[PDB]
Amino acid sequence: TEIEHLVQSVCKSYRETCQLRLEDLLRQRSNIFSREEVTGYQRKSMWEMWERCAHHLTEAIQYVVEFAKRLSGFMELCQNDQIVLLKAGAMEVVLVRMCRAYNADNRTVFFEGKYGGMELFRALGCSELISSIFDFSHSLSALHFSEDEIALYTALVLINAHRPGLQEKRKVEQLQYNLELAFHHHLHKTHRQSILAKLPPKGKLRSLCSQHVERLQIFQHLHPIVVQAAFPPLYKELFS
Ligand SMILES: O=C(O)c1ccc(-c2nn(C(=O)c3c(Cl)cccc3C(F)(F)F)c3ccccc23)cc1
Ligand SMILES: CC(C)CCC[C@](C)(O)[C@H]1CC[C@H]2[C@@H]3CC=C4C[C@@H](O)CC[C@]4(C)[C@H]3CC[C@@]21C
Description:
This protein is mainly alpha-helical. The protein has one domain. Helices cover 62% and strands 4% of the residues. The protein has helices spanning 2-17, 22-27, 35-43, 46-69, 79-97, 127-141, 147-158, 169-189, 202-222, 232-238; strands at residues 102-103, 108-111, 114-116. α1 (2-17) crosses α8 (169-189), α6 (127-141) packs antiparallel against α9 and α7 (147-158) packs antiparallel against α8. The longest helix is centred in the N-terminal third of the chain and has 24 residues, at 46-69. It binds ligand 4F1 and (3alpha,8alpha)-cholest-5-ene-3,20-diol. (3alpha,8alpha)-cholest-5-ene-3,20-diol (HCD) binds next to α4, α5, β2, α6 and α9. (3alpha,8alpha)-cholest-5-ene-3,20-diol is lined by residues 19-20, 53, 56-57, 60, 94, 97-98, 101, 109-111, 121, 124, 126, 129-130, 133, 212, 215-216, 219. It is classed as gene regulation. The entry lists the keywords Nuclear Receptor, Allosteric, Inverse Agonist, Inhibitor, gene regulation. It forms a monomeric assembly. ROR(gamma)t ligand binding domain in complex with 20-alpha-hydroxycholesterol and allosteric ligand MRL871.
């Protein structure tokens, strides 16, 4: 029963920190940016679009930081390992969470109140990277992740004892094994083990995420935003 409590605890932590409600996102799908509104975004300076997207991305990260802080055992890890896992994993989770806000039928994402395609972001001059991010969401879309599946999967994205730099590797392994059992137990209970063979290769998410964060650090270097840090040790690593 300790595992069934873990399943419930992870799904609750996700429910409290998912940022956008799935029902709102599904019902808002017919609300799509017009030709004119899309041109309004394309005409904004790179630096204004950077400011908008940087702040949306930091805020999304902060919801993932909160999600992690409510996973059982995460806070009992030493602070160095908290940073290690979140630095490597929190943006991976944001990229996974994107698929809920992404409509595969027209290849649009929910952005500032409406759905728009990737050409909304033309002014940023990162079409290849942004296209990669949209492609990743598109492939995740085919799984039709339930809310509980995405809760358990993104927990496992964070709690990964293979991250370089961990000090108490055994403690992370214990949490990881419990979450893996929780995930696999729940998939069996719901007759959804078929998604296992369809999850993305682990190297794919890490590769895409490194390219994403790389571009973000280049913008941040040219045009630094600042936010009130949720997790200052983690913040002061990437922004300072
Ligand atoms: O509130 C905080 O404590 C906090 C808030 C955000 C992060 C965090 N930002 N980030 C970025 O890539 C980022 C973003 Cl999203 C926007 C602008 C600039 C950046 C950059 F400078 F780091 F490149 C991350 C990547 C991976 C993991 C955690 C984070 C960390 C901590
Ligand atoms: C600086 C550039 C790399 C900007 C990247 C452009 C993207 C890929 O075009 C970004 C811009 C804003 C991002 C979104 C900001 C916030 C959210 C809410 C979160 O719950 C899911 C991800 C989601 C929906 C993000 C998905 C990726 C987006 C939609």
